Amino acid sequence: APSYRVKRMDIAKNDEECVVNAANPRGLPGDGVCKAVYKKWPESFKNSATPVGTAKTVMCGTYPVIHAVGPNFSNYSESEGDRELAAAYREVAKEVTRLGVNSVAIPLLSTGVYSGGKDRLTQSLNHLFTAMDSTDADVVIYCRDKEWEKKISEAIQMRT
């Protein structure tokens, strides 16, 4: 019985068998959130570069870090941006399946400084759902805002 859950906490303190890093295509560490993923799994950033709309797994010991590069909507068109966001989540599902993990910690891609200053909770979450709905892994979504936690919780509830 694989479930969706949401937790308002630092993804770097996840209790899942792998994590998804909200990554840049340069495989570079970044600030804010990514700075805490880097600090907890720094050697996961060795050759972690992957193009926009792709995912790449780097092992930190035996702990898989899935570098998922959602589009920067500042740079992309709404329609291509949407295409790239869907693709990234699809590659995450592929990686989660290939790794054979029973659970994954995943943020909402392209909802922070890649959002183009827009609210993409529903857009990002629905693409997450489309991709992960075909996997048998428990999915734990990580956010920081209070409301977002609630809106994500409700969206999970009203599919079951």
Ligand X SMILES: O=C(O)c1nc(=O)[nH]c2c1CCCC2
Site residues, ligand X (CB under 6 A): 22-24, 30, 34, 68-70, 109-115
Residue closer to ligand X (CB basis): 91 or 138: 91
Residue closer to ligand X (CB basis): 68 or 125: 68
Cα–Cα distances in Å, from 151 out to 28, 57, 78, 119, 148? 31, 29, 22, 12, 5
Residue closer to ligand X (CB basis): 59 or 112: 112
105 has which bridge partners?
Answer: 19, 140
Distance CA 59, CA 24 (A): 18
**Three-state secondary structure string covering 58-111:** EEECCEEEEEECCCCCCCCCHHHHHHHHHHHHHHHHHHHHHHCCCEEEEECCCC
Shortest spacing between CB 160 and ligand X, in angstroms: 26
Residue closer to ligand X (CB basis): 119 or 136: 119
Shortest spacing between CB 124 and ligand X, in angstroms: 8
Residue closer to ligand X (CB basis): 37 or 155: 37
Provide the CB-side half-sphere exposure for 47 (13 A, CA). 3
Shortest spacing between CB 138 and ligand X, in angstroms: 21
Residue with smallest beta-carbon separation from ligand X: 70
Distance CA 127, CA 122 (A): 9
Shortest spacing between CB 19 and ligand X, in angstroms: 13
Token duo for residue 22: 């909200």
Shortest spacing between CB 18 and ligand X, in angstroms: 16
